Amino acid sequence: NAAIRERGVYYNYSKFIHDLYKRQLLLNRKILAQIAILNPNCIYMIYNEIIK
Amino acid sequence: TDLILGRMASTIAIHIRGKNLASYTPSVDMGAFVIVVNADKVAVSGKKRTQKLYRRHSGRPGGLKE
Amino acid sequence: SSRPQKKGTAHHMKTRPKKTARWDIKRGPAVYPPLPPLPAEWTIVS
Amino acid sequence: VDAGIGVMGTKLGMMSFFEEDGTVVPVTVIGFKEGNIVTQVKTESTDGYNAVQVGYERLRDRKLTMPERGHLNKAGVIPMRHLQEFRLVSVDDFTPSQKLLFEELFKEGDMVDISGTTIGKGFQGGIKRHNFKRGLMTHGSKSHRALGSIGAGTTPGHVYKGKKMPGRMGGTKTKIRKLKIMKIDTDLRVVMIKGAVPGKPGNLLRLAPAKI
RNA sequence: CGCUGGGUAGCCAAGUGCGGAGCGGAUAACUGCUGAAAGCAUCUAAGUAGUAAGCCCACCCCAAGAUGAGUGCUCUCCUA
RNA sequence: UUCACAUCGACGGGAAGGUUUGGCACCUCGAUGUCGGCUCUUCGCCACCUGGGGCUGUAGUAUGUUCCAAGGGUUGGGCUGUUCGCCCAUUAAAGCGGUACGUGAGCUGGGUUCAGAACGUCGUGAGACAGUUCGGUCCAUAUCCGGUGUGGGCGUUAGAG
RNA sequence: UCGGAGAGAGGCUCGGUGAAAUAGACAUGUCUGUGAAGAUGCGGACUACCUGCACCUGGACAGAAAGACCCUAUGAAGCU
RNA sequence: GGCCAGUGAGACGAUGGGGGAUAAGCUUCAUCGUCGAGAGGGAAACAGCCCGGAUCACCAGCUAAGGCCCCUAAAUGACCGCUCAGUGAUAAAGGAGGUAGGGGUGCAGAGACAGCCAGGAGGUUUGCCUAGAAGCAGCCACCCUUGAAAGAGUGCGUAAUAGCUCACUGAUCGAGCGCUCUUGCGCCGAAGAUGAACGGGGCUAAGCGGUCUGCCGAAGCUGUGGGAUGUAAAAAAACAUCGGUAGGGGAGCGUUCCGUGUUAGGGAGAAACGCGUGCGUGAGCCGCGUUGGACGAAGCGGAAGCGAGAAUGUCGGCUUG
RNA sequence: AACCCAGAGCUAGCUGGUUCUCCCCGAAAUGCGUUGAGGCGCAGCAGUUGACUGGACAUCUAGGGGUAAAGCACUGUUUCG
RNA sequence: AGGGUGAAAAGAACCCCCAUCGGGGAGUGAAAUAGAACAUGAAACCGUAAGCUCUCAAGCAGUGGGAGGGGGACCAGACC
Secondary structure (H helix, E strand, O other): OOOHHHHOOOOOHHHHHHHHHOOOOOOOOOOOOOHHHHOHHHHHHHHHHHHO | OOOEHHHHHHHHHHHHHOOOOOOOOOOOOOOOOOOOOOHHHOEOOOOHHHHOOOOEOOOOOOOOEO | OOOOOOOOOOOOOOOOOOOOOHHHHOOOOOOOOOOOOOOOOOOOOO | OEOOOOEEEEEEEEEEEEOOOOOEEEEEEEEOOOOOEEEEEEOOOOOOOOEEEEEEEEOOHHHOOHHHHHHHHHOOOOOEEEEEEEEEOOOOOOOOOOEEOOOOOOOOOOOEEEEEEOOOOOEEOHHHHOOOOOOOOOOOOOOOOOOOOOOOOOOOOOOOOOOOOOEEOOOOEEEEEEEOEEEEEOOOOEEEEEOOOOOOOOOEEEEEEOOO
């Protein structure tokens, strides 16, 4: 939640799961909260492909 | 200046913890220093200015400070 | 006086959290479309 | 905040001034060991308040340490023991360079306040600290002079803080107020003042005008 | 203290001095000043005035262990 | 004198409080020591006085009632174990209560009327009375919290006065 | 009333000797609320640097001592 | 049916009642739910209220009750209305131009409401009483006329009058005004004794009602892997199950002695005592010891003075103060 | 109504206590009776071993009632013409 | 109520501290850490040394995560 809220525009943690299950990503198991700090450019690729 | 008190206090709190950082661990001090200038001109809404009491008390009875 | 105070387990039938909004009782969990089944967890390779 | 600079002097016994009208007044006699030289002024610019810092009791240099005597020789004055300031409103004209102020400023001002260390009485009981009453001396009683009850019952479960117990009574300074001045002596360096100052003859004594 | 008669310095009061001040701030009850929602009115909804032994400050003392640990002045760090 | 609402308010009704007597028997009987007094608190306002005000069948003095206000005060005694209460002299007034009697690991009398005795009454009697009277041991070096004083260490980013 | 002073034996300090009742372990705050309906131990807030010494005893439903009062026992005993 | 136990003090919550005062966390019953014997989550804490039934592991996911400002996980989410009392925890009778509506009924472009101004008179002081009662101390009805309208008067006042004034009508500006029911949320009523004491901070929304989408949220479910019980009578595999007090049944570990046993082993170190990067569901086993110095395993069996944290147990040792 | 010894390890419907592990199952606080009420006997409800059995849970239908509601036709009671 | 140094007292010649008690060397013994309080010696209890760490802190003292630091190491990622 604290990783996603760094965008500034009002994108919450609930909307990341809106467009995390609509775009069919089965069960990343909140280990994107691990590579959200071990690989912040890769979680920027995660979220920037959730947008598209 | 002209900011309401409690929502400013919550958004100062959410940075004073470190819950805007992906390095947030609630057992260490990952937060950030904040500075609040112009504390004399903090807005409040309704009738806080004449009805909200910051009372305190020492240990002995009859010391509750209005 | 003659107004009884509500003691324990009468305090619990009165001051428990009850969601008395007819909208928020109607809510079921969200439904996503079904997906094809995931493949095998591992495979013997010789 | 005081309404003006005061002096400090030592108590030298008590006596009775005979007024020429016929009355007999009990006066305390004040001496002055050395002039109350203004040593250090602290104004609004270089300090958060404004006060005039005087001292007293010129001594031998062996009696006084290096930071003390360095502070006093920063002002270019004599090495002296006692040292106190008076906080005063920002209209002051006081130079810290050896203003040997003379004692004429209190005679027309027939009201003065004094502060001083009262005489200590050590660890005294509740019968004299807080003016309690003693129990029955007889009739089979056993709580002679004792402190009695201390708190209430079960519901506090403790005793209230600031409760009147025995302890060390005297030793702190006190100020008694609006004490009318009397016959100064411009050659005996002695001021009569009708009252009773805190302490035995010998101690320091703040002598500063009133704050009414 | 054998029992009495007085007493300096201490301690004490019954004795001796002093204190309880403020056209300082904001209020509770109340009296109001203009004054609308109903072209009348009304202490109020805008603004605002007198005022309580009550609240705070001023008053006397302690007080930066106020860990938020203050401020100012001054002294001393040398030989291999 | 007219006049429900200056002041009382019948017949009735609605509340708050937990200070009396009660109801339940929920903690405590391998022990929560009752009533009164002394000492010493602290707190509530449902205000006796002191401060401000409204109304008065308030001419003024003194009031009657009521609003705000609990900072401070609320006497000395004869009777009784007395709480309460009566009376005297007053005082601005001599408030009512909570804090397990507020307070017996701070202190003393009547009492859960203990063991002796007597009077009345009850009982055939032993004995008994929410009847009366005389006499009748009350312990204690504070471990911790709490309190009042008073230090020592360390900290206050060099060390101090 | 209305306490006050003084003299001894203690109390305080030092040197010697040196127990006791008690004790689940104690890193043992206040208010307020809850709870077997009176909490340092649970909850929220506030307050408290650590640790001694000397006094005071409000609490630890403090120590004693399987409540003398009340009731139960198909208990015991004295007496009529 | 056979053998063989406990239990027979219950508690609260909903409904049906009696006793009470339709008072009690009160007492007694009847059906049910929970606790008892139930863990977890929500309820600030908190046996009985809601969800829910804990075999175990995972630094797995989806949910129920309940929540999404911060303390504390998730929406300072969206759109309609409401509240201005911090109501948001609280208790009523009753009062109220509070505010947002809703239903009725009555007046207006032939001027509707509010204010100013004008009139409000004649018989008449209706008849009784009183000194006077002239509408105003009261008793009885409580008129008609001019008219634009005036009531034996709406109140004050006067010795009584006189008089001030109103219901009603006339006149100027001008467009909404009454008076009743009613909800929603509010105000007062509403005051306790140690100290905010109502989770806290606080918030005019982060409060209250109506919908829309998602997320957080248990030890629930799902997934991946073990264990055991029942089928079951061998193994494998399958399905169901596996909270538990009083209690019942099944299976095991350990101790000292005895048969094998003058056992294997052991002054090249047995038992003890202390040790583990080992194995078991666990009671425990096995292994290692610069300590110690002579006994004694396992397996297959048997018998107990057989297993310790409780008895104001008890005996020694040693603390606290 | 002494003390010591013995019956006597009196008796106690009372109090405290009763020690290793794992797995499966799992209550009751009710009735009746009691010189009984904090005890006990039986029933109810457990465990285990059986023998007969074919039911449980949903839906429908049929029977007797006299509760809730209702009502004044009986028994009372009551307001008014 | 109080048993067990050794196999054999071979029970410590002599030197030092020194009034003794005791202690250290030396000597006996396989063992003197088997020394007459003498055989294995555990727990409570009292200690001393080494590593890390506590003086703004509310706690049935744990447990889950683990900052920083220390130690040996060999499956150096592991263990305490």
